[PDB]
Write an enzyme that holds these catalytic residues in place. Sequence first.
Site, PDB file in Angstrom:
ATOM      1  N   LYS A 542       0.615  -0.933   0.308  1.00  0.00           N
ATOM      2  CA  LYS A 542       0.020  -0.086   0.314  1.00  0.00           C
ATOM      3  C   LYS A 542       0.641   1.171  -0.150  1.00  0.00           C
ATOM      4  O   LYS A 542       2.176   0.639  -0.039  1.00  0.00           O
ATOM      5  CB  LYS A 542      -0.801   0.223   1.262  1.00  0.00           C
ATOM      6  CG  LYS A 542      -0.112   0.023   2.855  1.00  0.00           C
ATOM      7  CD  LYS A 542      -1.577  -0.053   3.780  1.00  0.00           C
ATOM      8  CE  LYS A 542      -1.577  -1.487   3.904  1.00  0.00           C
ATOM      9  NZ  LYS A 542      -3.293  -1.081   3.692  1.00  0.00           N
ATOM     10  N   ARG A 543       0.500   2.679  -0.409  1.00  0.00           N
ATOM     11  CA  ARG A 543       0.770   2.934  -0.764  1.00  0.00           C
ATOM     12  C   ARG A 543       2.033   3.851   1.242  1.00  0.00           C
ATOM     13  O   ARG A 543       1.377   3.926   1.993  1.00  0.00           O
ATOM     14  CB  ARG A 543       0.419   4.484  -0.584  1.00  0.00           C
ATOM     15  CG  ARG A 543       0.048   4.859  -2.082  1.00  0.00           C
ATOM     16  CD  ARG A 543       1.420   5.262  -3.152  1.00  0.00           C
ATOM     17  NE  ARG A 543       1.756   6.746  -3.067  1.00  0.00           N
ATOM     18  CZ  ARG A 543       1.703   7.416  -4.374  1.00  0.00           C
ATOM     19  NH1 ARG A 543       0.912   6.684  -5.206  1.00  0.00           N
ATOM     20  NH2 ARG A 543       2.526   8.623  -3.976  1.00  0.00           N
ATOM     21  N   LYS A 548      -0.501   4.480   7.788  1.00  0.00           N
ATOM     22  CA  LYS A 548      -0.770   3.276   7.391  1.00  0.00           C
ATOM     23  C   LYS A 548      -0.010   2.477   8.418  1.00  0.00           C
ATOM     24  O   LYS A 548       0.029   0.641   8.309  1.00  0.00           O
ATOM     25  CB  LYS A 548      -0.659   3.412   5.974  1.00  0.00           C
ATOM     26  CG  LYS A 548      -1.687   3.504   5.204  1.00  0.00           C
ATOM     27  CD  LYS A 548      -1.039   3.967   3.539  1.00  0.00           C
ATOM     28  CE  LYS A 548      -2.117   4.160   2.025  1.00  0.00           C
ATOM     29  NZ  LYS A 548      -3.463   3.186   2.269  1.00  0.00           N
ATOM     30  N   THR A 650      -8.835  -1.295   0.296  1.00  0.00           N
ATOM     31  CA  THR A 650      -9.593  -1.835  -0.621  1.00  0.00           C
ATOM     32  C   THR A 650      -8.382  -3.028  -0.887  1.00  0.00           C
ATOM     33  O   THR A 650      -9.024  -4.232  -0.739  1.00  0.00           O
ATOM     34  CB  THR A 650     -10.272  -1.216  -2.275  1.00  0.00           C
ATOM     35  OG1 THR A 650      -8.770  -0.300  -2.654  1.00  0.00           O
ATOM     36  CG2 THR A 650     -10.798  -0.599  -1.844  1.00  0.00           C
TER      37      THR A 650
HETATM   38  C1  LIG Z   1      -5.826  -1.973  -3.780  1.00  0.00           C
HETATM   39  C2  LIG Z   1      -4.857  -1.021  -4.074  1.00  0.00           C
HETATM   40  C3  LIG Z   1      -4.446  -0.179  -3.162  1.00  0.00           C
HETATM   41  C4  LIG Z   1      -5.235   0.273  -2.017  1.00  0.00           C
HETATM   42  O1  LIG Z   1      -4.880  -0.585  -0.931  1.00  0.00           O
HETATM   43  P1  LIG Z   1      -4.537  -0.536   0.422  1.00  0.00           P
HETATM   44  O2  LIG Z   1      -4.630  -1.483   1.198  1.00  0.00           O
HETATM   45  O3  LIG Z   1      -6.413   0.027   0.265  1.00  0.00           O
HETATM   46  O4  LIG Z   1      -4.419   0.845   0.524  1.00  0.00           O
HETATM   47  C5  LIG Z   1      -2.714   0.949  -3.565  1.00  0.00           C
HETATM   48  N1  LIG Z   1      -2.790   0.161  -4.658  1.00  0.00           N
HETATM   49  C6  LIG Z   1      -2.893  -0.643  -5.469  1.00  0.00           C
HETATM   50  C7  LIG Z   1      -1.674  -0.747  -6.435  1.00  0.00           C
HETATM   51  C8  LIG Z   1      -3.862  -1.547  -5.551  1.00  0.00           C
HETATM   52  O5  LIG Z   1      -3.743  -2.749  -5.901  1.00  0.00           O
END
Ligand SMILES: *Cc1c(COP(=O)(O)O)cnc(C)c1O
Lengths: 810, 810
Positions: A542-543, A548, A650
């Site tokens: 994730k970012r 986070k 997500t």
């Molecule tokens: C699903 C997805 C995100 C969202 O990830 P989170 O854990 O909800 O922040 C970010 N980057 C990519 C490439 C994703 O596939």
Amino acid sequence: QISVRGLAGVENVTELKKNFNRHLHFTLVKDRNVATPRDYYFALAHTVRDHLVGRWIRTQQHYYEKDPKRIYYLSLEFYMGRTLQNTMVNLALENACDEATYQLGLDMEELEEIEEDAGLGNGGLGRLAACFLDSMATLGLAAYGYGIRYEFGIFNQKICGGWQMEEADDWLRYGNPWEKARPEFTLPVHFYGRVEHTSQGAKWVDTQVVLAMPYDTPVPGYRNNVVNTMRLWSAKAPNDFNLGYIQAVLDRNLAENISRVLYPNDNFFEGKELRLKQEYFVVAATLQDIIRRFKSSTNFDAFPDKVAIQLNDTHPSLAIPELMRVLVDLERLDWDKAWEVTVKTCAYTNHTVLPEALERWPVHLLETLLPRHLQIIYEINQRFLNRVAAAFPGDVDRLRRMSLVEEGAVKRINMAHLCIAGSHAVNGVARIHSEILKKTIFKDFYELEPHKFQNKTNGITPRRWLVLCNPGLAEIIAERIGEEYISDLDQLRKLLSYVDDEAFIRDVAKVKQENKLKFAAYLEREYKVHINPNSLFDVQVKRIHEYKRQLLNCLHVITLYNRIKKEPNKFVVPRTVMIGGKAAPGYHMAKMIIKLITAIGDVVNHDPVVGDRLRVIFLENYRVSLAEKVIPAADLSEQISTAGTEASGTGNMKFMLNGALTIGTMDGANVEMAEEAGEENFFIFGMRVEDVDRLDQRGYNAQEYYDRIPELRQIIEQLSSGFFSPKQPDLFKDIVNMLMHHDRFKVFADYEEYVKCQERVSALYKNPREWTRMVIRNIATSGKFSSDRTIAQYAREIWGVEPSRQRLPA
Amino acid sequence: QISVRGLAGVENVTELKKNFNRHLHFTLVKDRNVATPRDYYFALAHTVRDHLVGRWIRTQQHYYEKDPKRIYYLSLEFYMGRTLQNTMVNLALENACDEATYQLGLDMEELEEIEEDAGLGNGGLGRLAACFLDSMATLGLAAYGYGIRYEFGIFNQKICGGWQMEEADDWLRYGNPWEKARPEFTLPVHFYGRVEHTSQGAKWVDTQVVLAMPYDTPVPGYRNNVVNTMRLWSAKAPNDFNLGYIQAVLDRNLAENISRVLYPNDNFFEGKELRLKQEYFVVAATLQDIIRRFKSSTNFDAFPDKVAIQLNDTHPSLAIPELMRVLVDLERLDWDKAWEVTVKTCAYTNHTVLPEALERWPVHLLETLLPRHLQIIYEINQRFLNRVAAAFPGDVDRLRRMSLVEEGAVKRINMAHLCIAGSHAVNGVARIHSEILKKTIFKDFYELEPHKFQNKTNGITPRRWLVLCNPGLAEIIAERIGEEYISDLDQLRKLLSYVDDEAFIRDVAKVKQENKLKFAAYLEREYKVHINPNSLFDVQVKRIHEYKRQLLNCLHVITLYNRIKKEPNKFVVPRTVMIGGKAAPGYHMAKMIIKLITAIGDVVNHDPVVGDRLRVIFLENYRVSLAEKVIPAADLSEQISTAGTEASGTGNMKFMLNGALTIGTMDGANVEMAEEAGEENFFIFGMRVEDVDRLDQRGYNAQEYYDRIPELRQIIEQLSSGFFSPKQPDLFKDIVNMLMHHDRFKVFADYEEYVKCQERVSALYKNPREWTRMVIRNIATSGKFSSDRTIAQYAREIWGVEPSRQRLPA
Ligand SMILES: *Cc1c(COP(=O)(O)O)cnc(C)c1O
Ligand SMILES: O=c1cc(-c2ccccc2)oc2cc(O)c(O)c(O)c12
Ligand SMILES: O=c1cc(-c2ccccc2)oc2cc(O)c(O)c(O)c12
Ligand SMILES: *Cc1c(COP(=O)(O)O)cnc(C)c1O
């Protein structure tokens, strides 16, 4: 090979072969002697695209004749990833193309790896947009995504000496065989200029014109022959632009910069003029296309019966004053009727409560760039505040809090306030997040118009996020319950009756095993690094953000390391800790966290006493196509944001669907996922929202945790004293300093519960049969988190249109 | 319809129809309900292109296996015009496509009009390059044109209030279906940096890299199934370029500006850095491609047996030191062997003697931009001057005159000197021009190496310049002598035996008549202006220059006007005087001449006494596709440059071929054309070269002409006193002032003879039968001016390769 990938009919396979050779010869101008694998990828892409076009033309023709209400999903981001495999899956062509390619002596899977990600987003908000387009086409909605065709998407991340370096993502370099330029539908967008008042109303004059050229990309529904359109605008200069001669031609670049590059900030507002131009450019070109299509059916009363505009965050908020401008200034409706139409057209989705994400544009920018929009905004504000005054007479504080105009050294427009005033519906993106909108940051608006506020919990497409990336898991599920669950994910509930079935337990666990071997191998090939595939795959992707709490994860990693060093000869469940994600380029702290992770990996991966019991890997260049590989391979999903900060997430849902267990806080959609699986099937820890609030009320003091937890103190001492950075002892002092004195996200408050809960994960992993049974309970209850559910709820409760599973004719 | 356009076979027509509908559906993604004429053009272009590709792949494969010596034609300009019709003509598809389109209910000729000119040149030099490519493919040579894919070609010219305004020529806006991007063959080009001397030789280091991406365009031979390649380079930034973040991405524009725009100067040197970058960029990328292809056959001795590089003017002169750099610095040949190879590889064509056209680059530019090339240049110079010293001992003046380095406030490199020193052959472009090179400006070089200097008189392709633009004339010729003359234009000589044939006289004159009606009509439709099609069409079309003496033409126009006003009731042969051409943007004088022409048209076209006896039209936006229309329609071709200034001309040849008589000076190829037709069949007037020299030796005094010629004085008074500009009386004082005091081109010296000779033209036009008989003598003797002849002479006397009329298999 596998059934979910469709039929390889003799006729189908013969036609694909001939079409492939046709494209290689006529489209690519190559023969087999000179062709590279890239040529082969393109030939396949063109062959597959040919199957989309007839369906594309039929669908668009169908909407012309039936004239259904049209949904317009406006977003500055569409994080699409690769298109080829997704298109095969949705057209049922996957196995035929496998067969066809094999017979020409090629490996389809190698050709798949050549396609670039369309990386036109930062993270969750833009991937959500991509999932939604898939779901809208699968549900037969007449839906259009509109955005900007950026020439450079999210930067490619390289790790150099443990630091992130950014390289330009030149994704169009080799051409994009999916898009169709539509230069005939070019539209003008206006900037600068000034307002003249006539007897005939206000007129916006002496503007600079930029042209908006649209490119259309097909969006195929799942096996229903619907193909919807994603239209992205590119910026072009007019031909009389500037028009010594040479310099005038070179200066065309200033207008075309609008669509050059995606701002690489995730959940952070940067108030730059070029960003505001991007926002206006997509809104202005889109609205004119919307109005044009509506007029091809004077009478604006029916406009909201024929149009829905969904605003993905406040980034296209200028749709509201732009629609007013057109109705009032150009079509000459009176204010109140225009406003009525505007409100019933527009709906706003909020994606975050973090204050640093809220867009607040300086008045002086809007004044120079969009003088008429600023006047419409002040007028909206005045009429809105008169309604507040009348409902809450004498409440002068409420007026100041609710104003669209914030006072200060710099006056600013609050774009969230504008979206709320100018929308019939406002939704958050998970139940707790929507509750928080009602109780804290939009409380005043909720008291004025309770009926506006809704929840629409996020979901993900089971097409990309299961059938495409995890075909083995898709297959052993289909063997038991058939194929229908792919467009009706609630049917996964049928799997609870297999929780005690030895063959199914065995097959679930085997799939996971195969996925792990395949990822372990991929790590070696493309990035020269050697992992134990019998270890627990502990993934956080994730970012990189403070909220986070990648840092909380680091503290745990160092804790395991220090426990091993203290008792080297004790058994511990082996783990591979994988952390990946991009930092925004000017986010110094996020950049230090990446560097800390690599530094821990430098110490842990080279300690002979640790052996292969613990490995720390930083996954470089995390992006959609890397997510398709690492998520099927994960055992444990880290979702450990401080309660109250992750609006939904997500990623959490992708992992649930793919057979990982989750360790997380009661944040975002984690709360609904735990409620769906049962709390006993989830690794919940940490402060709840109420706990965070209690701690904030008396003051968070990090020193108390440091004073009371010796494991924590040792970690801080190691960081401070240069253990992880022998050549620069003080390298991590900003991290330490932030943790001890300025931590908005309360990393230490959750540390003890986190480590304890991590021990329970380890205890369960020792018992393979019970781990796999808990997994089955997760997968079996993941139905709710299909974006098909999300979209059906937007359709019924916001847009006022009925979803349909009927297939159009072939 | 007409025979030269080929067969419309039942099978051929059926296939074209099906391919058209395939492209409209699959390539353009349209059906017949939504398609615009532009869609229809594209469908046809793709259908035709499909016929080129198999031949393209076979030809390139043929060159790989046979390995013939390869010709590389390097030019900064390729003025191609439209491709669709040319491709049909060369593949023999014209009538089939006519039939196929007709049956789908479309007018092919309307679709042809939709294609943009590829306007990648200024005038004669770039059109010559385009004619040469056609001829090289027709003669079976293994030839490659190499240049720059400019994003903006020559500006579109708009006349506003009688002034030229320039608009950007956005010719790629709608896409170019002829080119194929070849991103896999991208090559780096280096700029700036510095030289380090090792023990291991010199090394060029710390350069900025720009990438050169090639686009290939097919060049079809005339009915021989040969298809050669034109490769144009585009500039792209490297991905780590600059690599806050956003600005680094936006700054990629500085590297990509190299290929953005064609310099719109014709025969004029402007010493700007961006132009030098263009010159180096095309040379560096081309040489690496050349060497690569040669290595795919260490041994550079054979290099000149396998490669010819033709330099089209001095614009790619840096090929010489670049080839030295590579051989010496990278392949480690010793100097003398490298030089030997360089000289035997390279050959230079000079296109002008005007001093303002000669490229003389300031040393300080080369020092900063190409430090290594400057060192190689000084070394070339030193060794060259040692050879001069040895042949002409003690002649210190010769050394200074012959130096590649010119002394002065600013030191400069003389690129012509470098081309001569570094080429085995130097040619001019018509017999008189080559003689002038030997006698005046390259006299010193001619005395050192007499054997280097050659003539290759220019020609034009009879494909574009007859069959394509003048199908009616092509047809009545083919009826008598067959079709063979199209690739063997000397066969037109057979027409002398029809000079007394009444049916042929009638048919020649009828074609001219039809062409005039068709152009008269086109003038009305697209530019709202009404001409008498029974008048003599008096055409001067070409770039606006002082040396080209559009001004002499203006003086004649005003003379006719003043004669009519003086004797209104006398008979005069009616004329439509058409003048067209672009001015370079900062060429003030050229811009005043355009304005004078429109001003004369303002007075002459609205005078009721003149009636339809005299009309003055300025043809806006003159370009290749306008030349295809106006040249077949002309009666009189104005070729009236001061003797000694037009190196060759090629417009003169287009008109000869198309049934116009010529009035011109003994300049350029006019001399050879008069010698081919007989002087009695040409309207020759004015000073010869020798006369100009005599006049220069004693001083040109314009006042003498003004004092002695009352018709001339009245014209000057009218100009001075505001007759042609009532609102600004002194508007034309720069023109007058230049004519009286500072005329390098001696307009008044040729005025009397010009007017007299114009009377003979009028006298002959009254006698239609004798006019048409003189026309026949012109067309019948135009064989020599085929670029097929030109190219066969370059092939035999410069390149050392044998032309071939053999057809490759289908
Ligand atoms: C699903 C997805 C995100 C969202 O990830 P989170 O854990 O909800 O922040 C970010 N980057 C990519 C490439 C994703 O596939
Ligand atoms: O992308 C960014 C995100 C955040 C951030 C901080 C706390 C909570 C949420 C987001 O802070 C930043 C600060 C910066 O100075 C910067 O240049 C940035 O790019 C960011
Ligand atoms: O294109 C140009 C051509 C000539 C020219 C003049 C005499 C003989 C030959 C060519 O002069 C110029 C002078 C300028 O100042 C200028 O900006 C130009 O573009 C030109
Ligand atoms: C042939 C041609 C020229 C060259 O004409 P000259 O009379 O030789 O100067 C210039 N422009 C165009 C468009 C041409 O076709």
